[PDB]
Design an enzyme around this catalytic site. Structure first.
Site, PDB file in Angstrom:
ATOM      1  N   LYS A 288      37.626  28.393  29.510  1.00 54.16           N
ATOM      2  CA  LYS A 288      38.255  28.096  30.789  1.00 54.16           C
ATOM      3  C   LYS A 288      37.215  27.765  31.810  1.00 54.16           C
ATOM      4  O   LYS A 288      37.301  26.765  32.516  1.00 54.16           O
TER       5      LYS A 288
ATOM      6  N   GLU B 286      39.378  38.107  41.880  1.00 51.62           N
ATOM      7  CA  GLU B 286      38.521  37.820  40.764  1.00 51.62           C
ATOM      8  C   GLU B 286      37.949  39.105  40.230  1.00 51.62           C
ATOM      9  O   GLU B 286      37.568  39.992  40.992  1.00 51.62           O
ATOM     10  N   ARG B 287      37.891  39.219  38.884  1.00 52.28           N
ATOM     11  CA  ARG B 287      37.341  40.352  38.189  1.00 52.28           C
ATOM     12  C   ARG B 287      35.864  40.287  38.405  1.00 52.28           C
ATOM     13  O   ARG B 287      35.269  39.236  38.221  1.00 52.28           O
TER      14      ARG B 287
END
Lengths: 50, 56, 499, 468, 62
Positions: free
Chosen positions: D156, D182-183
């Site tokens: 991705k 976002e992680r």
């Protein structure tokens, strides 16, 4: 033609900022005082017209 | 004119059936038809040849 | 230049205000404001805030009045002075809205000058009475095969267009507007429709593409576009269909036939949902407002074909429902279905499988749409709707031993399915549809294998015009088949079918 | 001095009471001085009595009710400029790249009104991407919303990176990778990767600007990250006249964040738990993506399906805004094909006879018809036997498997990653390539000699090398 | 009143903005000259052709 139209818009925002500059000038002046007198006498006329 | 040409093209196809070793003559005629149609589509695609000045 | 326009504007501000009523806002936010004063307010009035936003009073309470903001919160600030517009919510209506994109306030967002409008008329109005209704008889031609005869539509007629999300739902309606290009470029005022395309909950870009499409097909000059994009405030969106319908009524009340396409009322439902929840009224069934039925019914029943005594006009209505998950059971869809007469359900599987547009005939019905029909297209098309809902049954159990009777029906049905197909943005003459339907009904499309049916159709039409456009000219004027026309069609169809 | 004393801290909803005739306005920015520096609270209601209700963008822990507040007015104004390229900035607009204060000439409010009806451009032009596969089966276009589907680990990030590279060659525009919640593990990786692939390089070139969301940051700050990104992009578009490409992470997490903020603000939760203000929040976000007469933003957004429910309102609302969907699959990657794009699941709004050009449309339609038939043919062909292919059918099998391989093209970014230099193939040449393959001019050369080839020109080379 | 103040001020004090042709040129696509006559050259020329066609004309048509 496209830039000609763009230039009309650009002029409009330039002269808009000149209007803002005129506002800063107006609220400075004791035209601010004298036009309050103008508002006062006008309000008298309005309220008497009621 | 162009219709004469195409009558000869397809006539030559059914003639070319009857002549072997002349199996790529018809491909040349097909190519001639192709480019005739290509230039015709150019001519129909054609822009006006003058600058617009009544709106421009 | 620009200076002259500025000078015109400065000159265009004149006279000092004369006001004698105001309220001052209490608490504001959630798109509702609570105002103190305005005791002389009319109910459902339009009020103007000092922020310049305007709102409609909904809740008149003994101490406070609760305006609903048609606009954005950022504009408004607490403790502002709201002065009453003095008019119940009205929108300019008149002839000069013709060929203008407008927002729901009536501000021209195409900005083709200030709108020329005869009047303004209140947004909510009661629908014409029983006695003001004359039963429909004048059709609207859609130029789409099945629509224009298997699911025919009238004038003033209310018939649903329901189906799957972004199946290019919009296109079906556009084609109607296009088909009626020569009707509306017609000189017969009875044949003139004036079509309003209400775009609700749609991206401003997408609407602009639509506008450009319409202006490419030069259809704009006979049509109005009302726009209520997604960005526009949720209450404004709520008031958007009602306002559009007022404009339609001005045309209707000129006794002139018209059409209004409300794309998509499903987005009005979400809008009303937002408004209701923000009015903190308990969620209705399926969490959509409890008055959602009322919302739709008051909107929908304004479409009418006025009685001959009281004019003759019409305002045809086709409202476009975006079925979530394509399942027609669902509170908002069913509520609409019950209001409408006829449906134009579209099937996604078929849409993907190249029926453009894919008019499912299992869930498409038309009731009083078939009381306005071209008699020629009634004669040729008789019971074909039944036949192709026998085709539906036959192929149900086809997927088995197939009796010759069923097999014949299946063979016809499949061939007919090919005939049904249309090519998007290509509208067809009514006259031209008459021979094509004759052929298939009389089973002459056995004579053309299924793959080449499409070839046959175009060739057949070319044949018909070349062989005898006399027949079509006759159907153009007579509009009802005669024995001579019937025989001529038998003869002509057999002749072309052979070649 | 517009100052007020905190008069509630029920949740992260902090009500501040201001002294009379100094009242804030809705969407103003308040800054509460704290040993946490400041906490920026954004006014989201007026509760009257000279009290307001605000949301917080940073944790409200240890507040003493009555603390002095300072009103900065209007929506939070974040620095903008080419100075902000390659700077990770948190929501409040302060460096989290740790490279210290970013000197950027202007700062601009995070809430801004969508462009006018007039300002919408009347046509959507196909934005070129070096990836032929993208340009064939779902052409990108100006002002477009292209909704990614698939899972991370298919590449991705690499797909996204490739697009940045392509954009730089194609336009020379900008990008802003906006990551919604976002992680942080992934965020470290992205920064490292982006540095490594040099789309951000210290004193070097910086194209993409990073705004990374954090799930530890309050729900309110999750809601506002998107708007911050949008502003940066608009400065580029409007005031630097450049096309932009703005990535969004989960828009599921955009919705999810919004839902919480609604509930905190106290509103009746709408269906499937989602916010009552659901529509409007997407509407504002996705109507600032338009094609202006100065530039056009383009947005690739990521849609994390909620338990595979496509019936859910949050997906539905998203799909309404979306213009294209790119449906990456891991199955495709397992057929060795990188692009990972699933050809029969990707669709775009732009992909019509007139819209993408008649030739391109016809070519595309044929290639699509070919692939569609190939898959279906393979269903019973594989089972029954390859000997049961008709002359017509094996023509399709030959063409298709060759097309399938011809789709595979390395990525410039993934020059290292695949080991093969990328092929950025232009749109005109994409059409040309498929035309020849349709005409059978090509497809007389082995299947593997179309593997990882670029354009038509490339497989001329591979034919020669295959022979050599 | 305020109308008068604004009116007077706006009109009188009105700025002139840049509108130079040089600046304009930057913002527009520049004029391109004629496309040059070129030469239309037609295939089949030289005695290469003559020898080729005489030779080519030998394949018996069966």
């Amino acid at each position: 033609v496209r830039y000609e139209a763009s230039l009309r818009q650009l002029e409009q925002r330039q002269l808009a900022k000149s209007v803002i500059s005129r506002v800063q000038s107006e609220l400075g002046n004791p035209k601010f005082q004298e036009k309050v007198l103008q508002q006062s006498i006008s309000e008298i006329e309005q309220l008497l017209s009621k | 004119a162009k219709s004469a040409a195409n009558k000869l093209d397809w006539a030559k196809v059914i003639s070319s059936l009857r002549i072997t070793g002349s199996t790529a003559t018809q491909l040349s005629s097909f190519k001639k038809r192709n480019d005739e149609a290509r230039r015709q589509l150019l001519e129909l695609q054609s822009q006006p040849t003058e600058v617009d000045f009544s709106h421009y | 230049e620009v200076s002259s326009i500025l000078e015109e504007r400065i000159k265009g501000v004149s006279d000092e205000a004369n006001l004698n009523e105001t309220g001052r806002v209490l608490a504001v936010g959630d798109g509702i404001a609570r105002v103190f004063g305005l005791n002389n307010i009319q109910a459902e009035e339009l009020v103007e805030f000092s922020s310049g936003v305007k709102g409609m009073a909904l809740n008149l309470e003994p101490g406070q009045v609760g305006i609903v903001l048609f606009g954005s919160d950022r504009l408004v600030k607490e403790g502002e002075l709201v002065k009453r517009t003095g008019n119940i919510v009205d929108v300019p209506v008149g002839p000069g809205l013709l060929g203008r994109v407008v927002d729901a306030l009536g501000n021209p967002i195409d900005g083709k000058g200030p709108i020329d409008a005869a009047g303004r008329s209140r947004a909510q109005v009661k629908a014409p009475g029983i006695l003001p209704r004359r039963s429909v008889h004048e059709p609207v031609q859609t130029g789409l095969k099945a629509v224009d005869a298997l699911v025919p539509i009238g004038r003033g007629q209310r018939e649903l267009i329901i189906g799957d999300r972004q199946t290019g739902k919009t296109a079906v309606a556009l084609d109607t507007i296009l088909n009626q290009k020569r009707w509306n470029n017609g000189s017969d005022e009875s044949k003139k429709l004036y079509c309003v395309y209400v775009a609700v909950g749609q991206k401003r870009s997408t609407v602009a593409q639509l506008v450009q499409t319409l202006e490419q097909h030069d259809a704009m000059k006979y049509s109005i576009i009302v726009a209520a994009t997604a960005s526009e405030a949720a209450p404004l969106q709520y008031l958007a269909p009602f306002t559009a319908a007022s404009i339609g009524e001005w045309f209707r009340d000129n006794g002139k036939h018209a059409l209004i396409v409300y794309d998509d009322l499903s987005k009005q439902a979400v809008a009303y949902r937002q408004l209701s929840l923000l009015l903190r009224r308990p969620p209705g069934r399926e969490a959509y407002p409890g008055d959602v039925f009322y919302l739709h019914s008051r909107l929908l029943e304004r479409a009418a074909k006025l009685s001959e005594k009281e004019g003759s006009g019409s305002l045809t209505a086709l409202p476009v429902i975006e079925t979530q998950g394509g399942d027609v059971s669902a509170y908002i869809p069913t509520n609409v279905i019950s209001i409408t007469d006829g449906q134009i359900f579209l099937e996604a599987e078929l849409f993907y499988k190249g029926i453009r547009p894919a008019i499912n005939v299992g869930l498409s019905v038309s009731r009083v749409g078939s009381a306005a029909q071209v008699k020629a297209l009634k004669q040729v098309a008789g019971s074909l709707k039944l036949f192709l809902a026998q085709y539906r049954e036959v192929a149900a159990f086809a997927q088995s031993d197939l009796d010759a009777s069923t097999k014949q029906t299946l063979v016809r049905g499949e061939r007919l399915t090919q005939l049904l197909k249309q090519n998007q943005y290509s509208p067809l003459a009514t006259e031209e549809q008459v021979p094509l339907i004759y052929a298939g009904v009389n089973g002459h499309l056995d004579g053309i294998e299924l793959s080449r049916i499409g070839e046959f159709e175009s060739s057949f039409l070319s044949y018909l015009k070349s062989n005898h456009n006399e027949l079509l000219t006759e159907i153009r004027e007579k509009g009802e088949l005669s024995k001579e026309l019937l025989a001529s069609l038998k003869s002509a169809t057999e002749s072309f079918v052979a070649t | 001095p517009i100052t007020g004393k905190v008069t509630a801290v029920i949740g992260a909803i902090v009500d501040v009471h201001f002294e009379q005739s100094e009242l804030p306005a809705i969407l103003n920015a308040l800054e509460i001085k704290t040993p946490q520096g400041k906490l920026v609270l954004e006014v989201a209601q007026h509760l009257g009595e000279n009290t307001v209700r605000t949301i917080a963008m940073d944790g409200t822990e240890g507040l003493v009710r009555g603390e002095k507040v300072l009103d900065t007015g209007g929506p939070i104004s974040v620095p903008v400029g080419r100075e902000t390229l390659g700077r990770i900035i948190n929501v409040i607009g302060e460096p989290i790249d740790e490279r210290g204060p970013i000197k950027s000439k202007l700062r601009k409010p995070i809430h801004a009104d969508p462009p006018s009806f007039a300002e919408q451009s009347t046509s959507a032009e196909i934005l070129e991407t070096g990836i032929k596969v993208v340009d064939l089966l779902a052409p990108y276009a100006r002002g477009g919303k292209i909704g990614l589907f698939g899972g991370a680990g298919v590449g991705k990030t690499v797909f996204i990176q490739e697009l940045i590279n392509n954009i730089a060659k194609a336009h020379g525009g900008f990008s802003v990778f906006t990551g919604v919640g976002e992680r942080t593990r992934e965020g470290n990786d992205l920064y490292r990767e982006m540095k490594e692939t040099g789309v951000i390089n210290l004193e070097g070139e910086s194209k993409v600007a990073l705004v990374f969301g954090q799930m530890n940051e309050p729900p309110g700050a999750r809601a506002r990250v998107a708007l911050t990104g949008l502003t940066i992009a608009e400065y580029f578009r409007d005031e630097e006249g450049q096309d932009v490409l703005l990535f969004i992470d989960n828009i599921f997490r955009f919705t999810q964040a919004g839902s919480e903020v609604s509930a905190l603000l106290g509103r009746i939760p709408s269906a499937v738990g989602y916010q009552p203000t659901l529509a409007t929040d997407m509407g504002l976000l996705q109507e600032r993506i338009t094609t202006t007469k100065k530039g056009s933003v383009t947005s690739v957004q990521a849609v994390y399906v909620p338990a595979d429910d496509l019936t859910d309102p949050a997906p539905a609302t998203t799909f309404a805004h979306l213009d294209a969907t790119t449906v990456l699959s891991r199955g495709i990657s397992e057929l060795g094909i990188y692009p990972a794009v699933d050809p029969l699941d990707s669709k775009s709004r732009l992909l019509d006879a007139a819209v993408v050009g008649q030739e391109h449309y016809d070519v595309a339609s044929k290639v699509q018809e070919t692939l569609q038939t190939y898959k279906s043919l393979q269903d019973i062909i594989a089972i029954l036997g390859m000997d049961e292919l008709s002359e017509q059918d094996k023509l399709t099998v030959e063409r298709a498997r060759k097309i399938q391989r011809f789709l595979s093209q390395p990525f410039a970014v993934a020059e290292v990653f695949t080991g093969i230099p990328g092929k950025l193939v232009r749109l005109k040449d994409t059409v040309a390539s498929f035309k020849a393959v349709l005409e059978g001019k090509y497809d007389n050369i082995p299947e593997h000699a179309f593997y990882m080839v670029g354009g038509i020109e490339d497989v001329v080379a591979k034919a020669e090398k295959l022979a050599a | 009143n305020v109308i008068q103040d604004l009116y007077l001020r706006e009109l009188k004090d009105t700025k002139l903005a840049p509108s130079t042709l040089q600046d304009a040129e930057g913002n527009v696509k520049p004029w391109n000259p004629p496309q040059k006559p070129n030469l239309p050259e037609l295939e089949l020329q030289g005695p290469e052709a003559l020898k080729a066609y005489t030779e080519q004309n030998v394949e018996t048509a069966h």
